[PDB]
Amino acid sequence: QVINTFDGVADYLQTYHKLPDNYITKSEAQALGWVASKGNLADVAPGKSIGGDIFSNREGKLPGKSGSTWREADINYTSGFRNSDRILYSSNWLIYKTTDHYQTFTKIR
């Protein structure tokens, strides 16, 4: 099976300290041919979801420890345009969720 659910990815991150093999950055996706406005990710990178890019967190929505960095990954993606579901994970593996395109977050771990 493909690890792309909230619990599946949350557990993987906290245990393996990295995203599963089905995640690729936006820049890797783009170089493969992903064109956001065409929603072709599943055509150009079968089985992959966007994940691993740094999330800025300038709006102070997520709780940053002094030297921590936040990263994000798409959740529940299989085909077409990207959805609004994302998993947010910190340097010390704090896990947050958003289902409203980064408007609001809730802790899941």
Domain spans in the chain, listed from the N-terminal domain onward = 1-109
Q: Residue 85 is encoded by which pair of tokens?
A: 């579901």
Catalytic residue among 17, 28, 59, 72: 72
Per the CB < 8 A criterion, the answer to whether 47 and 74 are in contact is no
Residue 15: left if φ>0, alpha if ψ -120 to 50, beta else—which one?
A: alpha
Does residue 101 have an active-site annotation?
A: yes
**Technique behind the model:** X-ray
CATH architecture type of domain 1-109: Roll (3.10)
What span, in angstroms and rounded, lies between the C-alpha atoms of 2 and 91? 24
From 17, 28, 59, 101, active-site residue? 101
Backbone phi, psi, residue 44, to 5°: -90, -15
Helix (H), strand (E) at residue 20: none
DSSP for 21-82, please give it. Answer: TTEE-HHHHHHHT--GGGT-HHHHSTT-EEEEEEE---S--S---TT--EEEEE-S--SSS-
72 burial via Cβ count (<10 Å: 0-12, 13-18, 19+): buried
Asked about 72 being catalytic, the answer comes back as yes
| Resolution to one decimal, Å | 2.0
Q: Report how far residue 60's alpha carbon sits from residue 83's, in angstroms, rounded to the nearest whole number.
A: 23
